Amino acid sequence: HPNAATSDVNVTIDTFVAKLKRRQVQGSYAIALETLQLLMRFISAARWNHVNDLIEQIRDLGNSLEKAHPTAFSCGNVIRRILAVLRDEVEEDTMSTTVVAEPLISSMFNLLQKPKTDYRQVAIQGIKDLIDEIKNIDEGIQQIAIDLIHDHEILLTPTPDSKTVLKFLITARERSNRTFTVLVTEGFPNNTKNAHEFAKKLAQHNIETLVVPDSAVFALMSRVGKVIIGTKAVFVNGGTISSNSGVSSVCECAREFRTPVFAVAGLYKLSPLYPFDVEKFVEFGGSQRILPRMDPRKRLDTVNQITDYVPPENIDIYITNVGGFNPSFIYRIAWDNYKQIDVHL
């Protein structure tokens, strides 16, 4: 379905699209919030009474959005979650309208063999619930994080950008008796300013700062205790796409020198799409912030990428609001909130 009714029925769809394409919007969380708001708007004014059709429309909407931007996934994920929420309710409803138990929460063979209400209010409530979840993940991660940090241990932190990760760090630092020193890589292309900001914030609280060049990790890794990330996108076979610069090489180094790798994670930040090739999911960067002047660019070839992908061979734990989980296991977690049908929309 195209954008024919979805322009005067709801107000700021075009604005949202613009924000997505031209990157007026800042923050994955913020994107998610915007998506939620859009969904709310869709719900409030428009009337349907027919449910399956509505669901299909929503799927189409989500799909189009996803196709609009091949590396921002939060928007998609939120929509998927909402779909999932709706679907179970619909299934429940059908059984009442018309008027068997499984070994666990979900069966496998049911996919091969043949299997007015205050629903709007429930839907409304769902969005609110989602919003609340998005607001207070940290109040659920807090007492799962302070379960794996000790004394006299060097802590490496590449890509420190989010308000979540910072807060996590702050909570740990509050218990100042717990001894930890912070090494922070600057992150060449984009992370630099952000890294500096993070360092400043650390200093504000009285947290010991060490500013790191990206070439110099091999020289530090043997002294590094525990490594924490604050990723953007979480995946199927265990790996992640992190918010830009210097993560692959770091991970390789860790693997070689055998180093523990923490990752701050959220299930809404987690994607059920499988990454199969480097040739697609890895997002490249601008040469504008490398070298001024364009006449040397005639013969040479500058190669740079913003956000980078991680193979699961390296990271080991995903500290969520639910708990820290294994990378060669997180698929189950995802499926406890997502499906195999809502994949290729």
Partner: protein, 355 residues
Amino acid sequence: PGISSVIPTVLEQSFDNSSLISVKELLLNKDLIHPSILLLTSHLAHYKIVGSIPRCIAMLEVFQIVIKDYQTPKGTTLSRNLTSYLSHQIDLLKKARPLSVTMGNAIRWLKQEISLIDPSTPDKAAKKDLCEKIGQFAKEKIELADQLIIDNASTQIEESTTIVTYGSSKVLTELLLHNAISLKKNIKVIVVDSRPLFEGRKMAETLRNAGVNVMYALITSLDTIFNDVDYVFLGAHSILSNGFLYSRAGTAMLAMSAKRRNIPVLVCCESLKFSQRVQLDSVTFNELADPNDLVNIDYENPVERRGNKGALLNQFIKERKFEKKKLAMENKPKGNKIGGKKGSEGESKDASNEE
């Protein structure tokens, strides 16, 4: 002698194996110091281009110049205070910035030469043959060695080659150029470079000036170009009698990656770069400059800007340290090509007795 100590930057709780600062801006210099040494010091202090090989050559040249300028006094003999002078110069160099193994070797050779010629021979005739012999030495233990390296590379490197490197090692540059214009072949040459220095950039520029297809690379994503890459040389500086390489920047990471993915890593060297001293980690003996090299927003080198950065003591504790020289590994750099032609770094000192 001048001014020592009284300088900014803390002692650093992490890494303090060598001292960190010195003499940059000249005032009250002694009335006997040769200007060439001073100028060299001034250069090295804020140097972009040179690293290991050309530095030594420059030093040699300077020494030759000094010798030319020197004549036997009426009171003091030819071997009376020369050695003292040399020592002073070495101390000045050390104060400025720590040195290389090749340099040490050269110094040793000079000392030997001082002993060899007896203080009774005609003075004019003495330095006549001295400067000739030094020139000969330079030709043999550098230029000839370089030639030999080139020829070694020639037999080994295949028809049509993609070569990936890091640094500013002049030998490698020469080799690349040779491959481009002299023997003539297809050369996809990729160079990597870090934040503080622009060695790689400079090399790329040089290659362009000779007309080569180049890819300019950075740390944040090396893998993106390998995952294709077939043959790789590293930034050679100094080998120890273990079988390692005390070398520049995150070359070690690259080497590791190479080891992981298909291919061995290889290095060319001069048969006088070798030491007999040994070490085994990037903590052992660190080569340091000021944490001021990374305050400015990148792009160029001399800029002067206003923004946010400029806090080494101002805010609530802020340490912004780095390294220049690190440890390259052993099991991976299997290739070594020298003045004695061939060998493995596993055979770490099989030419040190042969000399």
